[PDB]
C-alpha cells in the first residue's frame, strides 16, 4: 500500500542552481505512454 508525505511549498526560489541544456528532439509517443527517439 502506497502513501504520501509532504516535501515542501511550490515556490520559485530566486537565485537557485542554473544548470541544464535545451535540446530540440524529434520524438514519438506510443499508446502505452512511452516516448522514443526518431532519426
Amino acid at each position: 500500500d502506497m502513501y504520501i508525505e509532504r516535501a515542501g511549498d511550490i515556490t520559485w526560489e530566486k537565485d537557485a542552481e542554473v544548470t541544464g541544456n535545451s535540446p530540440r528532439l524529434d520524438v514519438a509517443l506510443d499508446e502505452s505512454g512511452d516516448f522514443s527517439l526518431v532519426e
Binding site: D1, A16, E17, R24
Partner: protein
C-alpha cells in the same frame, strides 16, 4: 488527513524499508501525479484515503480526490525551475531553460535534468509560481543523459 497545497513524496512499504516511487502536486484539494508512479492505485495520507478520479496511460497522468487542476503552460521562451524532490533528499529548485519535443501532434517543452526514477512527478514552475507540468516522462538521448517532457493535463 493532510490536504495542504504543496509537493509530496509517493512512498511504499511493499519493498525493503520505505521506498520513494515518485512525487506529486497537491492543489485545490486534488493530488496530481504521473501514472507510472502509482499505476492508478489508491493512496494514503495519515488515516485519510485518496482514491483515483481521472487517469490516462498515454498522457501518463492521474488525479486523486478530483479532476485535473493544473493548467499553466510554458511560454516557450522563459527559463523554468524543476522542483526536484529526490528519494531521501531535500527539495531543491533547479532553474533551467527547456528544450523541445517535436512530435507528430505538436511541440511540447522538455527539461534536460538528470534524476533517479523516484523523482518522477516533480512539478515544473513558472516565474509566478504556477505548475506548468510534471517532470518524469521522457527519453534517454545519445550520450546517456535523460530528457523529460513537460507533461501537463487538461483542465475542465
Amino acid at each position: 488527513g493532510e490536504t495542504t497545497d504543496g509537493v509530496y513524496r509517493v512512498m511504499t512499504r511493499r519493498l525493503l524499508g520505505s521506498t520513494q516511487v515518485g512525487v506529486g502536486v497537491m492543489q485545490e484539494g486534488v493530488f496530481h501525479t504521473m501514472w507510472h508512479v502509482t499505476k492508478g492505485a489508491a493512496l494514503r495520507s495519515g488515516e485519510g484515503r485518496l482514491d483515483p478520479y481521472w487517469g490516462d496511460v498515454k498522457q501518463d497522468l492521474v488525479s486523486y480526490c478530483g479532476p485535473w487542476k493544473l493548467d499553466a503552460a510554458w511560454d516557450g521562451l522563459s527559463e523554468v525551475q524543476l522542483l526536484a524532490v529526490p528519494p531521501g533528499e531535500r527539495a531543491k529548485n533547479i532553474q533551467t531553460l527547456p528544450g523541445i519535443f517535436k512530435t507528430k501532434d505538436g511541440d511540447i517543452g522538455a527539461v534536460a535534468l538528470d534524476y533517479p526514477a523516484g523523482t518522477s512527478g516533480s512539478p515544473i514552475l513558472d516565474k509566478c509560481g504556477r505548475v506548468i507540468g510534471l517532470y518524469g516522462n521522457g527519453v534517454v538521448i545519445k550520450n546517456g543523459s535523460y530528457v523529460s517532457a513537460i507533461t501537463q493535463g487538461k483542465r475542465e
